[PDB]
């Protein structure tokens, strides 16, 4: 028993981290097979960041300008190319520590682990969610760019995020491993609207099921609701509208606890309308939305 | 910017995890050099757990009864010995992935990362604190025994915890790597008093400094307090009494923010007396005590 904001073991990803330096800028790269992936803004200077002409900046660079170091050993760059907002540096050596991997584009509301890195060296690992507005509330400092987000299924690492930028609001933006930004963001030093965020309803419900499984039951009530009625409350409290597809993915947790999804919705409705009244659920005094239904079953069943 | 419950990268520890089976029981072992460490209750059956005579149970076992598997390869056991509540299985092969390591006994209130494992396979990593009452509020299921807690300083892993038991209250108990339990616990299936826990005051103060560094400042007030006055409030709210040694370790954060430790104590006093009034600090609606002053500076300075 017990429920924690658990991240995937980071070993398979640590073996892929490298340092990439171009000119005076240093950030992290991801070395998979004979390619190193990194944010294209490694080619910029501070005078460029207001609105960089990336095509022109990259034309001034040659393979030998990209210094790639894996720990203490230097990698030889034999090609470079820009794909969207990422650079792909072909190296003459395949990473011997390349795990089985995929590049995936995650949906908003899904979760992943981040391995925060500096100078190609891992500093820490944490779990987070891609917000419905395509931002992440991470922990990153200057030099963390190029750190990646991922999920692991057995021996396969599915890379879903590469960190690029911190918006003036302190929230984080990045790309998939093909260099496409999640959300409307551009890799420029400008104020950029993130847009209205919402709470991930399906994840809050999954976490209420985790709470029941792990002994916290004070919030269960004698009530039920409908999708329509619950969605009026979700509207009022800036929660994502619940659909039958969300009810369907909550099936396993509903079967495990014997609590019908709509009955759990009625508990969530009462907590939204009345608050926690000074009480806690799984060590939290707010409704947590960073655990998906899959995360709850995985943590409550010990998948390795 | 941003502040997360960050765990150490687990790679160095993943390389040490093995499966240990004795009779019908399977749990995790830690393979460092030519020794595998695991909880001694691997030698028990369910009939033994009420009050096992470990000495007698171990006398019935021979080296060949301990099956140790590192991934898919079997390790040859050439010796066994019980030290306190751990077994040390000498194997004929040094773990090639042994990192630089130490065995340390952590103090209550200090934090560490846990690599939860099942059948010698890592499942997830999370950060937690050793409670003042020597329990941990972890996330562990049946088979997680033998999972370890650790801290990393550059290339050295300091192992501080090995998981042994879940108390009937759902909280966790374990040992240092010499097999000494933290707290009064014994490795028996009995109800065992954990004793009064308290909130780690120095860690709450460190997290309030982290909040100020990362932009959350609404809780700062026009007041100051003394150690004596603050400790009367700490007494009332079941917080650890603050000492000058705690004020001294908060020095760096006080210098960084320009907020005198006693001024931050006055903010903590007001939050204890008035609550959060429906507001949050670093995404939490309660006062967080799982970040030490060292953790806050490390996360806010990007140590790798
Ligand atoms: O945001 C940037 C640089 C930057 C500026 C403009 C556009 C792009 Cl694509 C990249 N770097 C950081 C990332 N994450 C966190 C940070 N924390 C502090 C300072 C810097 C951070
Ligand atoms: O507590 C035990 C077994 C046990 C019983 C009595 C004494 C000792 Cl030293 C060990 N194992 C578990 C550990 N952590 C978490 C669990 N969650 C569920 C079931 C079992 C768990």
Q: Which residue, among A2, A260, A303, A1, has the nearest Cα to A153 in the 3D structure?
A: A303
CA angle B85, B88, B89 (to 5 degrees): 140
Q: A233 CB contacts (<8 Å, ≥6 apart)? A: A225, A239, A269, A272, A273
Dihedral of the alpha carbons of A181, A130, A104, A40, in degrees to the nearest 10: 30
Give the whole-angstrom CA distance, residue B112 versus residue B150. Answer: 5
Residues B127 and B259 in one domain: no
b/e per residue A82-101 (b: at least 16 CB within 10 A): eeebbbbbebeeebebbbeb
Among A1, A10, A304, select the one facing B125 at the smallest CB separation.
A10
CA distance B147 to B140: 9
Structure-determination technique: X-ray
Length in residues, chain B = 304
Q: Where is the domain boundary, A46, A68, A99?
A: A99
Of A37, A67, A99, which residue is a domain's last?
Answer: A99
Beta bridge partners of A49: none
- Residue B215 and residue B116 share a domain: no
Number of domain units in chain A: 3
Write phi, then psi, for A152 (nearest 5 degrees): -125, 130
**Resolution to 1 decimal, in Å?**
1.4
Is there a contact between B4 and A128 if contact means CB atoms under 8 Å apart? yes
CA atoms within 13 A on the CB side of B13: 34
HEC profile of chain B: CCCCCCECCCHHHHCCEEEEEECCEEEEEEEECCEEEEEHHHHCCCCCCCCCCHHHHHHCCCHHHEEEEECCEEECEEEEEEECCEEEEEECCCCCCCCEEEECCCCCCCEEEEEEEECCEEEEEEEEECCCCCCECCCCCCCCCCCEEEEEECCEEEEEEEEEEECCCCCEEEECCCCCECCCCCCCCCCCCCCCCCECHHHHHHHHHHHHHCCCCCCCCCCCCCHHHHHHHHHHCCECCCCHHHHHHCHHHHHHHCCCHHHHHHHHHHHHHHCCCCCCECCECCCCCCCCHHHHHHHHHCCC
Separation between Cα atoms, residue A6 and residue A128, nearest integer Å: 9
The residues lining ligand 2, judged by C-beta closer than 6 Å to any ligand atom, are A 1; B 41, 49, 140-142, 144-145, 164-166, 187-189
- DSSP for chain A? -----PBPP-HHHHTTEEEEEETTEEEEEEEETTEEEEEGGGG--TTTTTS--HHHHHHT--GGGEEEEETTEEEPEEEEEEETTEEEEEESS--TT--EEEE--PPTT-EEEEEEEETTEEEEEEEEE--TTS-B-----TT-TT-EEEEEETTEEEEEEEEEEE-TTS-EEEE-TTSPBSSS--SSSS--------B-HHHHHHHHHHHHHTT--TT--S----HHHHHHHHHHTTBPPP-HHHHHHTHHHHHHHT--HHHHHHHHHHHHHH--TT--BTTBSS---S--HHHHHHHHHT--
Show Cβ contacts of residue B154 under 8 Å, excluding neighbours closer than 6 positions. Answer: none
| CATH code of the domain containing A28 | 2.40.10.10
Q: Which two tokens stand for residue A91?
A: 């190296």
- What is the C-alpha to C-alpha distance for residues A47 and B173, in angstroms, rounded to an integer? 55
Are A209 and A277 members of one domain?
A: yes
Q: Is B280 exposed, middle or buried (0-12, 13-18, 19+ CB in 10 A)?
A: middle
Instruction: Produce one character per residue of B215-246: b if its CB has 16 or more CB atoms within 10 Å, e if not.
Output: ebeebbeeebbebeebbebbeeeebbebeeeb
Q: Is A239 exposed, middle or buried (0-12, 13-18, 19+ CB in 10 A)?
A: buried
- State the CATH number of the domain containing residue B212: 1.10.1840.10
For residue B137, give the nearest of B171, B108, B162 by alpha carbon: B171
Beta bridge partners of A91: A77
Clarify whether residues A145 and A239 are in a common domain: no
Q: Dig out the tokens for A23 from the structure.
A: 């000119």
Q: Do A173 and A41 belong to one domain?
A: no
Active-site choice (A16, A22, A38, A41): A41
Distance of CA A203 to the CA centre of its chain: 14
Considering the domain architecture, whether residues B142 and B1 belong to the same structural domain is answered as: yes
Sign of CA dihedral B221, B224, B226, B228: negative
- Give me the residues paired with residue A122 across strands: A117
Best of B256, B286, B304 to disrupt the A interface (most A CBs within 10 Å) is B304
Strand partners, B199: B239
Within 10 A of B189 (CB to CB), how many other CB atoms are there?
15
> CB-hemisphere CA count at 13 Å for B107?
3
**Residues A296, A193 share a domain:** no
Q: Are A189 and A172 in contact (CB under 8 A)?
A: no
User: What span, in angstroms and rounded, lies between the C-alpha atoms of B74 and A58?
Assistant: 52
* Contact predicate B115/B10, CB 8 Å: yes
Statement to judge: residues A157 and A202 lie in one domain: no
Region of residue B154 (phi > 0: left; psi between -120 and 50: alpha; otherwise: beta): left
**Same domain? A204 vs A291:** yes
CB atoms within 10 A of CB A238: 12
Burial of A173 (0-12, 13-18, 19+ CB in 10 A): buried
Tell which of B51, B84, B99 closes a domain: B99
Contact A30, A38 (CB under 8 A): yes
**C-alpha–C-alpha distance, residues B136 and A172, integer Å:** 32
What gap in Å lies between CA B234 and CA B266, rounded to an integer? 11
CB A45 within 8 A of CB B160: no
Asked whether the beta carbons of residue B172 and residue A2 sit closer than 8 angstroms, the reply is yes
Cβ-contact A11, B99 below 8 angstroms: no
Beta-carbon contacts of A84 under 8 Å, excluding residues fewer than 6 positions away, are A175, A178, A179, A180, A181
Encoded tokens for B51 = 């009050």
- Owning domain of residue B174: 1-14+100-197
Residue A82 sits in the same domain as residue A173:
no
**Strands A148-153 and A111-118, how do they pair?**
antiparallel
- Tell me: do A105 and A207 sit in the same domain: no
Instruction: Name the residue among A9, A14, A128 with its Cβ closest to that of B124.
Output: A9
Distance, in Å, from the CA atom of A244 to the CA atom of B196, rounded to the nearest integer, reads 46
What is the number of other CB atoms lying within 10 angstroms of the CB of residue A195? 12
A118 to chain B: which residues are within 8 Å by CB? 302, 304
Contact flag A6-B300 (C-beta cutoff 8 Å): no
Contact call for B7 and A8, based on CB within 8 A: no
DSSP string, A153-189: ETTEEEEEEEEEEE-TTS-EEEE-TTSPBSSS--SSS
Task: Specify the pairing of strand B77-83 against strand B73-75.
Answer: unpaired
How many C-beta atoms lie closer than 10 Å to residue A76's C-beta?
A: 11
User: Please, which residues have CB within 8 angstroms of residue B277's CB and are 6 or more apart in sequence?
Assistant: none
CA distance A257 to A251: 10
Q: Does B111 lie in the same domain as B68?
A: no
For residue A71 the two structure tokens come to 């720990």
Residue for token pair 């994840």: A203
> How far, in Å, CA of B143 to CA of B116, rounded?
10
Query: Please, is A228 exposed, middle or buried when counting C-beta atoms within 10 Å of its C-beta (0-12, 13-18, 19+)?
Result: exposed
How far apart are the C-alpha atoms of B291 and B283, rounded to whole Å? 14
């Amino acid at each position: 028993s017990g429920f924690r904001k658990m991240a995937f073991p980071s070993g398979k990803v640590e073996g892929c981290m490298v340092q990439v330096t171009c000119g005076t800028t240093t950030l992290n790269g991801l070395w998979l097979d004979d390619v190193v992936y990194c944010p294209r803004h490694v080619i910029c200077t501070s005078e460029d960041m207001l609105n960089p002409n990336y095509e022109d900046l990259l034309i001034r660079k040659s393979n030998h300008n990209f210094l790639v170091q894996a720990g203490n050993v230097q990698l030889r760059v034999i090609g470079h190319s820009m794909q969207n907002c990422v650079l792909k540096l072909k190296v003459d050596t395949a990473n011997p520590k390349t795990p089985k991997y995929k590049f995936v584009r995650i949906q908003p509301g899904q979760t992943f682990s981040v391995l925060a890195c500096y100078n190609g060296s891992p500093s820490g690992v944490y779990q987070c969610a891609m917000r419905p507005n395509f931002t992440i509330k991470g922990s990153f400092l200057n030099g963390s760019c190029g750190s990646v987000g991922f999920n692991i299924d057995y021996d396969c690492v599915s890379f879903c995020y590469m960190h690029h930028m911190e918006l003036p609001t302190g929230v984080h933006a990045g790309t998939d491993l093909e260099g496409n930004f999640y959300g409307p963001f551009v890799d420029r030093q400008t104020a950029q609207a993130a847009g209205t965020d919402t709470t991930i309803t399906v994840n809050v419900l999954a976490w209420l099921y985790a709470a029941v499984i792990n002994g916290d039951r004070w919030f269960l009530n004698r009530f039920t609701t409908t999708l329509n009625d619950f969605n009026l409350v979700a509207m009022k409290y800036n929660y994502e509208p619940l659909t039958q597809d969300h009810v369907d993915i909550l099936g396993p947790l509903s079967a495990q606890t014997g609590i019908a999804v709509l009955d759990m919705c009625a508990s969530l409705k009462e907590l939204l309308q009345n608050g926690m009244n000074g009480r806690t659920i799984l060590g939290s005094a707010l409704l947590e939305d960073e655990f998906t239904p899959f995360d709850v079953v995985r943590q409550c069943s010990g998948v390795t």
